[PDB]
Amino acid sequence: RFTGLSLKQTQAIEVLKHISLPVEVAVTQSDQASISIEGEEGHYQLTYRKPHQLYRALSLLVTVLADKVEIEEQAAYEDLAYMVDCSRNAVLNVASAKQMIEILALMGYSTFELYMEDTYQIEGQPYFGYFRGAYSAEELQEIEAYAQQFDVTFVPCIQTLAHLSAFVKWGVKEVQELRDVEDILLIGEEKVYDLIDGMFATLSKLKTRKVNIGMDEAHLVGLGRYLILNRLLMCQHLERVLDIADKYGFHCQMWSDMFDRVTLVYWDYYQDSEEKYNRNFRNHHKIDLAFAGGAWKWIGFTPHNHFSRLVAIEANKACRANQIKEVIVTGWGDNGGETAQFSILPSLQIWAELSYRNDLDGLSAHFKTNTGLTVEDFMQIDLANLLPDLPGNLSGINPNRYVFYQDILCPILDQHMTPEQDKPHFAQAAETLANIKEKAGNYAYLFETQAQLNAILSSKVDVGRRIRQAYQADDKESLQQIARQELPELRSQIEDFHALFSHQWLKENKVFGLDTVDIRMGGLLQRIKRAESRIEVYLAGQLDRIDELEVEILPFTDFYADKDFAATTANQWHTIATASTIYTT
Amino acid sequence: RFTGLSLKQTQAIEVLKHISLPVEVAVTQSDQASISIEGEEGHYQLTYRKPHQLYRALSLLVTVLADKVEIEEQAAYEDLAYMVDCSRNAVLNVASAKQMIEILALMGYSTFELYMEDTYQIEGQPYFGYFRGAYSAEELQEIEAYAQQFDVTFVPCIQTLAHLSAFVKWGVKEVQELRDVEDILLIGEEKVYDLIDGMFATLSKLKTRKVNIGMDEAHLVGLGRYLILNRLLMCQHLERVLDIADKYGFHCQMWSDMFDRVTLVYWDYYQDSEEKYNRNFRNHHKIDLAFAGGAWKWIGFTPHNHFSRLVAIEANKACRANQIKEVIVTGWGDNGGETAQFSILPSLQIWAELSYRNDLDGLSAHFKTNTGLTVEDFMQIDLANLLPDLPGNLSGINPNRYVFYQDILCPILDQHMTPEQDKPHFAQAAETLANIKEKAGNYAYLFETQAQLNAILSSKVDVGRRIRQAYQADDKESLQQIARQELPELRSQIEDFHALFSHQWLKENKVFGLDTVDIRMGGLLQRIKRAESRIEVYLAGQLDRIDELEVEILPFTDFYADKDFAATTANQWHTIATASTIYTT
């Protein structure tokens, strides 16, 4: 029995019943605090500064009530947002954007963002998003309106310069004419500014007038086809993009890195101290700033919520000591979008709590009411990354992925495994994750996938090495065993994982982009088979040496060579899977 | 019963008995003609200008004798060479370099060349050729000495600037420090000139003092890490490379394209007229020249000897009208080295005949004595490329490859198929190729592979389209048929092809690089399976639309859109197999 609620808010609370609502609530828009709940004896007054904040208050309300309740919150940040990568093969389907929106609402996010390089349609640009599951402006309007039900703002993150590799690869004149080098558009070229105009044109059919135009990471701007036909140049390009946006009413932000009518966004997912962020905040202001932090979900199949917690704590302290008014939580999907979309919910609760309380005092409490599980449990999703000899402050260490896609015969990451410490971690993690799966409810699909992965990894982490040992020691028992029993088994487990991945994928994303995963997994299964077949041939007398095994394994990279753990970072499938050429001509 | 033969030559003729030697031969080194055989009644005089020419004379001898024989030949070219790509995953094993050498000897080639970007070892450079099957200097010395048995010169084609993608991808300091951008080395950097010195050092342990230093196609020379730290520049880089080579005694040639102590090599595999080559010869001389033509074997699984014949005829006329003294026949292996090493023997005989006679009057005759089959038969190896509506003068049209690796659900090359004309070509070609296989002898493996391919292609060329037809017309008979009978069958055929490819591969090359093919084929089989599974789900009521099929297929490229055939050129596996990202981050 609420009071002072509008139509829209009453429907919102309805859709939001994630929550179990137990009470009389006087609801008033007050500048008193971000969120005030005050009351007792089953009658409460809840107020909010911003309308969207009704929904976190509600969650806190329902968490605190487990009668006298007195809660104030003054957020640090005027805007908190979550940005989903829909450009790395995984395009979040509508039904999942909605569930996502509902959950961000309950946490306290004001803004929802989709990063689409080429995954939104443009009229008369039919190779822009071709077979990519590009969003229709319907889908973008439907999604935006759903967020609007909760007073949540939609900001498109797009690209107007570089990161356009999947559009520009198409070899028709009308595309090729737009290029300069690699993934970067031809600045100054008129065709380009007509494409960009179609972009904002398509964006203009939504209600938001806030956009992120991208412009990160274009090392080679004007060094290919530009240099050929005709740096400064960026500003020329930028003012133009701005003139275009200002034509359709848009306010623009862009990623800072290549560096008054645009906010710059200093993005940093990596620093383990206040100091480090503080220094770069100095350097940034020195050119209107937002901060993008990281919900680590771009390192293979498995997230890193633990590492996201650590860096979020110190970036929050830096954000506030530099009175940064806007923070963006980024969920990138580097190299295939293979990590689950809902993998990083703890990272999202963490940032909200840090904004609304400057601490993680009520994290698990709020998280459980929003998800139906404790934040310690959910965060076990990271297990395949959490090797026990790693310090929690070094980023991107991702065995989840490079243990999985490594070849058997030619195991080029074998120097980065520590099987005595690794094999048991993975096994028991599979055990822990099966447990959690059973209480995870609608999220169970997430943990089912990680449990099978961890199972595969306990075995796979050193089959390649044991093959090498069993072969230099001439042991026909072991090689025959690996070849006739263990490798075929691995393939079976891997088929199972594929099935679970596919289900996870289709639940969260559109069908498009899954094909890359089918290909990569198909290939792995086929390399496993070669290992079985090559051994059998060596076993039937028909082969002198197994040459692949005669190769001494070097370190894969020296990125973390000077550290006291063997593991490392390796996030390109193609250099994981083979030392041969696969992409080059 | 020969006469005037040395030890070395007597052993050579022995190894060369490819040939059946039937006679008394007076053998003399004369400047009379390239090759003179004159005689009758079972007693002949054979002379040669160059010692290696003994071996083509012998073949001609044994061809003409099928008694009065009177043959003179004055070659156009001082040096004729064949260059094998050993840098695109396929590294020709020793036993196959030898068979190759013996065959080049019989044709008239003076020079044998291996293109190794990173596929020769260098002391203290253990990531240079790591798991690539890099040649040992033993293997290079063994190979060279084998050629020397026939008076054949070995020239290494290497790289000293760009095309080094498989070395530079390794993320250790000692490698990364050598880079500028993409596949191009850091010019001016001292570490680089120490690497290059190790290259010539390793090359210096062979007898040849002739090298091709590469330096083709470096669009971005000094535009990445160069521009960052410090064009002209090329010459600086070049003189340095030359100073290094001149230290170890080497005479240098290099590919012309980026443009007195170096021969330039104008390379052109494409022009269908004397005129076109003539114009570019003008432009070249205008800066000491050799010509590189093409034995087309870099377009997937299947060569194009027919197209190699056509262009070789007109490039021979241009070569002679510009008194070009050296011609190089290049066998590149773009994007996987998936075409057989011995696929292009007709192209090699063709160039030899053009050099030694300025015509193809004795081509089939000489070819059959060297191979044991007619040149028309052997050249049926090209069938999977020879669509009947294509004109023989447009290059790189390669359905052999893009019909094979295309997806089923998302068949992005479907606009380039003409099944009514394509399906029957492939079927009967499989028939023709099974025939030839049976008479091909030791070469049968080559045709066995093309017959299975053509079989797969008759079916595969339009399954994707028929899926789309059977689905927009709601026909549950056809979709169930394709899904439960035809797709599983395709997979079976594809497994068979894989087996035959693997055997072909291992016969000709080292095991390394086959892994890329396993991966690509594994992936295709897995996409076929998805097509079966997605249909079944649509068939069991559990799916609304099959979304993949709801996508209108556009042309893949407009490269040949203005022509009267539907087919095209598409030679990158990764853009063939999927419109998603697979390589990008």
Ligand SMILES: CC(=O)N[C@H]1/C(=N/OC(=O)Nc2ccccc2)O[C@H](CO)[C@H](O)[C@@H]1O
């Ligand atoms: C604005 C932005 O975030 N752009 C890319 C970003 N790019 O991040 C870096 O380049 N980091 C980095 C690389 C080398 C040294 C130090 C930091 O990282 C994400 C996760 O990997 C992505 O892939 C984004 O698409």
Ligand SMILES: CC(=O)N[C@H]1/C(=N/OC(=O)Nc2ccccc2)O[C@H](CO)[C@H](O)[C@@H]1O
């Ligand atoms: C010296 C040389 O031959 N270098 C590359 C060459 N590169 O050839 C071109 O770049 N042709 C070309 C490309 C665009 C327009 C016109 C000609 O072709 C071969 C076959 O494809 C290769 O891949 C070689 O490694």
